[PDB]
Amino acid sequence: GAASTNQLQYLQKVVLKDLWKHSFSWPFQRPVDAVKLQLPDYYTIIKNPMDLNTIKKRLENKYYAKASECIEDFNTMFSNCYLYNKPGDDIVLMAQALEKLFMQKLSQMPQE
Incomplete structure (x- = not known):
């Protein structure tokens, strides 16, 4: 789109x-x-608050000027879960497994 065009594509696809x-x-x-x-x-x-659909629609609508703004939203989704809930809660264990996958995919993101 504008800044970090291949990176926004990677975050979406x-x-x-x-x-x-x-x-x-x-x-x-x-x-x-x-x-x-x-x-x-x-x-x-x-x-x-943040959820995957909000990120999906933001990517669809070209809401993010740069990829770092989208990464911030992913990170917020996880941090909100750990803030509201407690260690050992089922939702927290689910988030942790998703966050591990997120960090792998983010680490493989090609540079600009």
């Missing part, structure tokens, strides 16, 4: 796709529905 395909991705695919999940404090504690 490799990183996002491979995280989505991962079997643990489903709790991270859409914004947390705090009414349906009965979590009235979720959006009190998490002020920068």
Whole structure:
């Protein structure tokens, strides 16, 4: 698009796709529905919420001027999970496995 054109493509076609395909991705695919999940404090504690669909649509809409802004959103998805929940929680173990895959794919991203 503009800055980091091949890198934004990689984030969309490799990183996002491979995280989505991962079997643990489903709790991270859409914004947390705090009414349906009965979590009235979720959006009190998490002020920068992020999910894979928001990243997907942002990439589709060319929202990111550079790849680092998209990487920030991926990292925020994980950090929000560890902030809201506790060690040993099922959602935290799922996030950790996804984050390990994310770090592999990010490490393989070709330079600009």
